Amino acid sequence: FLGAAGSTMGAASMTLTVQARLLLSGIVQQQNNLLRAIEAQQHLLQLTVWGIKQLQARVLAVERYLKDQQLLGIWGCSGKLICTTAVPWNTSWSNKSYNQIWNNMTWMEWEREIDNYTSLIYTLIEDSQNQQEKNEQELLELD
Amino acid sequence: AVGIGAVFLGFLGAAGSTMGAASMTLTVQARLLLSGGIKQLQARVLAVERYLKDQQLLGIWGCSGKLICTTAVPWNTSWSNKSYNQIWNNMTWMEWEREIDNYTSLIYTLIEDSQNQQEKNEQELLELD
Amino acid sequence: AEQLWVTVYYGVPVWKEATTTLFCASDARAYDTEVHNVWATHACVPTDPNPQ
């Protein structure tokens, strides 16, 4: 929850032991009280300008949550926070050395370093590992 | 002022291929299933309400988060007179889901209540030792 | 012979015919500045698609 946005990547993994600062917990403690049924204690009393906007607000709260669970769901990394993969890093993506990425770098600058290359990494996890391991697992159950 | 050919795969690109060639392709049909004057909003809920159902049925079967998985439910040869290597090397999926369309309801009941319901009462009572 | 067991798959490329809602996705250049283009209704969805 953005408390370490000026910290470094080699140090922000220390405070990330809290559940991304209880990231998703702020949603459930919100939608317990977003679903205060005073909206149902009125039926909004009409259709109003705000309730049009709240309806377009809750949808984005639904969709953009799902696009982050699905991508974690497909990567063999459902529900975890720090998982490793089988994909080898290609040095053509970034010729930065080891410590400069971790000890000597922010996060948002590192986004603009590989925002070009990000989409290639997405395919190169699924079709390289999570499509792939499931067949090789199923072969190991053939016996 | 752009343009290069295909690299990995396309959307629905394996839908004329065999099963053994489409089984390595499932992620592209898995990603774009969700993302893509009120009548846009009525679409933006049906696209959600279809996604949860397919997500939910994988959840009940002990098979959530995996793309593929196996069970212990036995295949019944009454359902298919097709030989084995004809299925994995000759038949496409679009043809295949016209052939087992009728049996589908029998299948889904015979996954949950057959096994993954039964693999919890057996599972919970492997304690006490 | 061997015993066979059912195996679940996800993302299987099949389809049936359906009838759903499509949406307008028009041009998005010169819709501003007095262009009250009733077909565009001020550029209905501003996509300007890349039709792959």
């Epitope: - | 002022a1 752009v2 990995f8 592209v28 | 792959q52």
Partner: nanobody
């Protein structure tokens, strides 16, 4: 920066030479290049183009299949090899850099196909000249 060529001159029909454009200071693997052909007393004709990673090559239709281009990002060189020479190929060749920077290839999600962006030119080399005659 500095931008010239080499290997120019005059040859016969049916022959084959290769020029050599050399850049000076900018990071050469970052940028794509081009080739242009100004005929004497005429306008300009586009010839060729290479991607920054030397993977994408687009030729003109008239000189299609005959010529050859390549890169060497370490040696910062730029080659235009040519084959099956004709007399109407006698003109001024110029080595030229893209104005903007280019990125890496894009890979649209919906179809597994990359995309190399291509935009026009700012720095024309003064260029050699090849004449095809007897």
């Amino acid at each position: 920066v500095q931008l010239v060529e080499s290997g120019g001159g005059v040859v016969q029909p049916g022959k084959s030479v290769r020029l050599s454009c050399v850049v000076s200071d900018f990071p050469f693997s970052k940028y794509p290049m081009y080739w242009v052909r100004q005929a004497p007393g005429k306008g300009l004709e586009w010839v060729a183009a290479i991607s920054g990673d030397a993977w994408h090559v687009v030729y003109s239709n008239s000189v299609q299949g005959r010529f050859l281009v390549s890169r060497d990002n370490v040696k910062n060189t730029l080659y235009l090899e040519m084959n099956s020479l004709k007399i109407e190929d006698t003109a001024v060749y110029r080595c030229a850099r893209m104005f903007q920077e280019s990125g890496p290839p894009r890979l649209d999600r919906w179809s597994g196909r990359n995309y190399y962006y291509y935009s026009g030119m700012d720095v024309w080399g003064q260029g050699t000249t090849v004449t095809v005659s007897s």
